[PDB]
């Protein structure tokens, strides 16, 4: 099979999600691995809603797909060794990657400080940027989006009737992401190599085999697919999802 999208998720071990508010339905299915839950969560037309997070029950072997994450309203985290929560990074972001096409955070205020207009609303500014016309772009509520992958970055229509649209001020992910020395103590959230290749998850042996087992190295920060320096390398690094590139250095600026 070809689909491999589990890297796109932030894992919270021993955690499941419950929503107090019974609204927003959930789909559950008997599935063998967490990888299959992830591919279904990120697939186009895979679920009767936009999947933001999922939980893999390891004991019962089930996926639990949610249209919400742990940062939504009326949703609690709950304990259980058999559970593993996975939240799509796009909705946690807080920062931007390049044009910010993948950005799906909760910023709803323009660069000037004006509240964004709802995307599904024609007031004050009528338009054609509707969720129906741009599936997969998460044109929900009044959050800053970059649907057409334009140079300016994430933008929105403005609540002020005098300004139609404006860009939003969201910093590039390489903004606060800095390291001390050779990055031995770096525990940040960088997940792509210096050439822009996507990092392989540490808790995975595909497509590259390695000895850096998260269970074997607590305190080493082998979470998700973040760039790490666990072996005295000149710079932090990660294994790559490209079969023809085992590993590659990451580009994290020094805090000094």
Swiss-Prot record:
Describe the location of the PAN domain by residue ranges: 4-90
Q: Which cysteines are joined by disulfide bonds?
A: 37-63, 41-51, 95-173, 116-156, 144-168, 178-255, 199-238, 227-250
Please, which domain of life does this record's source organism belong to?
Eukaryota
Q: Where is the Kringle domain?
A: 95-173, 178-255
Q: What is this protein called?
A: Hepatocyte growth factor alpha chain
Q: Which organism does this sequence originate in?
A: Homo sapiens
Q: What is the lineage of its organism?
A: Eukaryota, Metazoa, Chordata, Craniata, Vertebrata
Range of the intact protein held here: 34 to 289 of 728
